[PDB]
Amino acid sequence: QPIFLNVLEAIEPGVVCAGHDNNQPDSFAALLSSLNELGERQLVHVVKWAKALPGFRNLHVDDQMAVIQYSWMGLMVFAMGWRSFTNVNSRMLYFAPDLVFNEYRMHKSRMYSQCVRMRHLSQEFGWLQITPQEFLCMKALLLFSIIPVDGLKNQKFFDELRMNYIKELDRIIACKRKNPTSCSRRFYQLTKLLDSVQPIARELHQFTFDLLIKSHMVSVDFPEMMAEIISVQVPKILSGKVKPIYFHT
């Protein structure tokens, strides 16, 4: 019995609305303020999701908060890509049921280039024929893909946990394939996909940080948790104190 998968499927977060007023014009202020609220809302689900993951509670409470604070961007973008793929077939960015981005909004949000990259990520799910099980194991692995260069409180258990989630992904690939070249080819493709998430998350990190600094001048509201994490944790990533863990060099 696939205990691990049972857990991942059982704890997968449901639908989250942004609360966007689709009646008012597509302004930068409105679009970004709603994206910020969506983030605040999804942050709640990411925390509950993570705490329910196999072995996560073995991490020191401070490390638990740390990995979530550093990896949320990538986690949310990856799940959004999956939603877009399965809903609008990756043709539009399905941030939330009430906040779907078309080309016009991509331009209005002033993050069109970033949206293009997210669309590409979304299309990869289709191009690679990623299964729901692969998606779930890969997403779980993204939580363990960014840490401080100086290490975590109990780095050793984080290392064991990360290793186990890699083992589970490899297992999911092999649990559906007999050929070694196929398994090896698939593992290569998926680790490459995971790596591609980081550059995108990085651009969004830089973008949201800059936006926070002058949010008062462009009329963009940042919720409490988002504001705290973006001014305290994000700068640690942008300054090089916290770095992603890539599979490939």
């Binding site: 942050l43 709640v44 925390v47 409470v61 638990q64 908060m65 409490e224 948790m225 705290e228 994490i229």
Partner: peptide, 8 residues
């Protein structure tokens, strides 16, 4: 802090 309350 809603964040700490989220873990607490």
């Amino acid at each position: 802090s809603r964040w700490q309350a989220l873990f607490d």
